[PDB]
Amino acid sequence: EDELYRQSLEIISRYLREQATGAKDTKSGATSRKALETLRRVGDGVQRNHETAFQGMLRKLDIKNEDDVKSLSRVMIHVFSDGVTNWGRIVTLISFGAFVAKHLKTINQESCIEPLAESITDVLVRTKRDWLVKQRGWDGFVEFFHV
Amino acid sequence: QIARKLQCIADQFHRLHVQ
């Protein structure tokens, strides 16, 4: 019933899971494909450049289980509390999400990766839908970061 | 704060990638 939510979740969940597992997944394909490739290029870069800061942030969050996920949900909402939305903030959140997914994999909480992806998708689709639609969704995401 | 740091990082990301 909500195609933008479904597509966004598909892109974000796939990226978070393949970052965690190290293998891509086998199971709107055109736009989603390009977005994922874009996310790999750009998102990996963010994690590399800001690995130290990401580590510090993770420790302060103290994520041990599914209920800890709400604490990231509150943090992510706070990011946009200044009324500003752009692709830079969105990719940064998705990148930190991938970083957290890696952490969940290392602490044997792999089942927490999906709820993680859903909470990130909740913040972006549920609270920033109008902006996302204005950017032509993930097609605009791909165009914004085209090189 | 974590949210403020993520904001800062997002800002660095843009300034590094603007062309």
Contact yes or no for A87/B13 (Cβ under 8 A):
no
Q: What is the resolution of this structure in A?
A: 2.0
Q: Which residues of A touch B7 (CB under 8 A)?
A: 79, 82, 89
Query: Which residues of chain A does B16 touch, with a Cβ-Cβ cutoff of 8 Å?
Result: 49
CA–CA gap between residue A19 and residue A72 (Å, rounded): 18
Nearest one of A46, A27, A24 to A36, comparing CA atoms: A24
Nearest by Cα to A94 from A123, A52, A133, A137? A123
Distance between CA atoms of residues B3 and B8, nearest Å: 9
Show the tokens assigned to A90.
Answer: 């969105």
A62 vs A123: CA distance, rounded Å: 20
**What distances in angstroms separate CA A114 from CA A64, A73, A132, A133, one per listed residue?**
15, 14, 22, 24
What is the number of other CB atoms lying within 10 angstroms of the CB of residue A134?
11
The experimental technique used to determine this model is X-ray
Per-position DSSP letters for A29-93, written without gaps between them: HHHHHHHHHHHHHHHHHHHHHTHHHHHHHHHHH---SGGGHHHHHHHHHHHTTTS---HHHHHHH
Helix A3-21 with A137-144: angle, nearest 10 deg: 50
**Does B6 sit within 8 Å of A57, measured CB to CB?**
yes
Nearest to A72 by CA among A44, A105, A35, A104: A104
Q: Look up tokens 């830079």; give the residue.
A: A88
Interchain pair B14, A96: CB under 8 A: no
- Interface touch A53/B5, C-beta < 8 Å: yes
User: What are the structural domains of chain A?
Assistant: 3-145 (1.10.437.10)
Say how far apart CA A76 and CA A37 lie, in whole Å.
23
